[PDB]
Amino acid sequence: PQITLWKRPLVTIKIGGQLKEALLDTGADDTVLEEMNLPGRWKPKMIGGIGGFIKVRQYDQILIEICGHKAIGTVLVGPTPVNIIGRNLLTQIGCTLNF
Amino acid sequence: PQITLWKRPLVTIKIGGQLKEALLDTGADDTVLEEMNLPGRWKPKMIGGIGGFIKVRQYDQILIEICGHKAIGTVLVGPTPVNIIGRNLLTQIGCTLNF
Numbered sequence: 267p268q269i270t271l272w273k274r275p276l277v278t279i280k281i282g283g284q285l286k287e288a289l290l291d292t293g294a295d296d297t298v299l300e301e302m303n304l305p306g307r308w309k310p311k312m313i314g315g316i317g318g319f320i321k322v323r324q325y326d327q328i329l330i331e332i333c334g335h336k337a338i339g340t341v342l343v344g345p346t347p348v349n350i351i352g353r354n355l356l357t358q359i360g361c362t363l364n365f
Numbered sequence: 366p367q368i369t370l371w372k373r374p375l376v377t378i379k380i381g382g383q384l385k386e387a388l389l390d391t392g393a394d395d396t397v398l399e400e401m402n403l404p405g406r407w408k409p410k411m412i413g414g415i416g417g418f419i420k421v422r423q424y425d426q427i428l429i430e431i432c433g434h435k436a437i438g439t440v441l442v443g444p445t446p447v448n449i450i451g452r453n454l455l456t457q458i459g460c461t462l463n464f
């Protein structure tokens with residue numbers, strides 16, 4: 267599809283057997299998801315943006331489906347106000363910017 | 366152009382007569398630039414990001430050229446970690462997400 271940017275580019279994703287709404291975010295290197303109790307091992311991490319840093323849990327090789335497009339990669343879980351799909355997964359679904 | 370996301374979507378912008386590097390950021394509602402001198406009036410504003418809220422100077426109806434495309438709109442200036450081009454200006458240059 268083609269997504270215009272009049273509104274936030276929110277799409278449904280599927281992760282850990284759950285459906286969620288997430289931002290397609292070209293400004294995020296990595297994917298950051300709202301607090302959820304994923305299984306498996308993880309590593310602590312700190313990520314910074316506007317306002318400072320938040321503490322997140324880094325999970326590797328997590329399967330995510332974005333608009334029926336499957337992807338697998340790193341997912342950061344922490345107290346983010348929004349689910350953020352970053353470039354590490356956007357590349358995998360063939361997402362580009364166009365103007 | 367068509368911009369892939371294996372790298373950060375950085376582009377050159379012109380604002381206030383000065384060239385700068387900025388990030389095309391579909392996850393940003395607004396355009397937030399690092400501290401700089403801009404001519405004209407401004408008003409204090411607050412914006413929130415992943416780590417909390419910061420105080421910014423809001424400049425309205427500012428000319429800004431992005432990768433050769435002209436836009437005129439709101440620019441927020443403050444202690445952002447990165448110059449970001451948000452949806453308010455991405456729409457003006459005809460930017461969409463495609464996959």
Ligand SMILES: CC(C)CN(C[C@@H](O)[C@H](Cc1ccccc1)NC(=O)O[C@H]1CO[C@H]2OCC[C@H]21)S(=O)(=O)c1ccc2c(c1)CC[C@@H]2O
Binds near residue numbers: 313348388393394395
């Ligand atoms: C600032 C960018 C360079 C990096 N961010 C990505 C931006 O797209 C954020 C996304 C967002 C949206 C809504 C709420 C919170 C965040 N938008 C943002 O702040 O927008 C401002 C201006 O407009 C307003 O509308 C939205 C909020 C205000 S991030 O979220 O800080 C981030 C993500 C991953 C990762 C990092 C950092 C570091 C490591 C990891 O890869």
